[PDB]
Amino acid sequence: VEGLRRARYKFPGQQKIILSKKWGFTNLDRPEYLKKREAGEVKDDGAFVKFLSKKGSLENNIREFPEY
């Protein structure tokens, strides 16, 4: 927060510092991300993750997320 506050002096206009309720850089709320992870619906690929959908072929959705 202090690091972002010091960066405002380099910018014209007004900026606001907002504490996001999402988990990291994902578009999901913290309770939603925790629920998906415990159900084995989240797979790591690099710095981001991939989710499991109810659509598509079972042949592809079984080899991925074997825990689910």
Partner 1 sequence: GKSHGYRSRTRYMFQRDFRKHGAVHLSTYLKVYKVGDIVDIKANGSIQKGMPHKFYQGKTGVVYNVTKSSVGVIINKMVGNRYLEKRLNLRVEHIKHSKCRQEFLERVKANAAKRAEAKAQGVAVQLKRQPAQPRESRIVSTEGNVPQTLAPVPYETFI
Partner RNA sequence: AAGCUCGUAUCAGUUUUAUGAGGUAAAGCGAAUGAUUAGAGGUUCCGGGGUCUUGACCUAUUCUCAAACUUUAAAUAUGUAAGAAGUCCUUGUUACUUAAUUGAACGUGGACAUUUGAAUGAAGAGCUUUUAGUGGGCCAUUUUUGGUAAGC
Partner RNA sequence: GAGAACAGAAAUCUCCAGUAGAACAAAAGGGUAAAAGCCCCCUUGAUUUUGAUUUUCAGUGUGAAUACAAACCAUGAAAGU
Partner RNA sequence: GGUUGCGGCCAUAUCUACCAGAAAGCACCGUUUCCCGUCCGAUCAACUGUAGUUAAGCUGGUAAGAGCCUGACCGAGUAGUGUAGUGGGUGACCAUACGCGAAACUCAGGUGCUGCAAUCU
| Interface contacts to RNA, rule CB under 7 A | 13-14, 25, 27, 45-48, 50, 52-59, 61
Q: Identify the residue among 6, 11, 12, 18 touching partner 1 (CB under 8 A).
A: 18
Q: Shortest distance, CB of residue 18 to partner 1, whole angstroms?
A: 6
Cα distances (Å, whole numbers) of residue 4 to 20, 21, 55: 14, 17, 41
Q: After which residues is the chain broken (C to N over 2.5 A)?
A: none
47 near partner 1, judged by CB under 8 A = no
14 near partner 1, judged by CB under 8 A = no
21 near partner 1, judged by CB under 8 A = yes
How far apart, in whole angstroms, are the C-alpha atoms of residue 64 and residue 67?
9
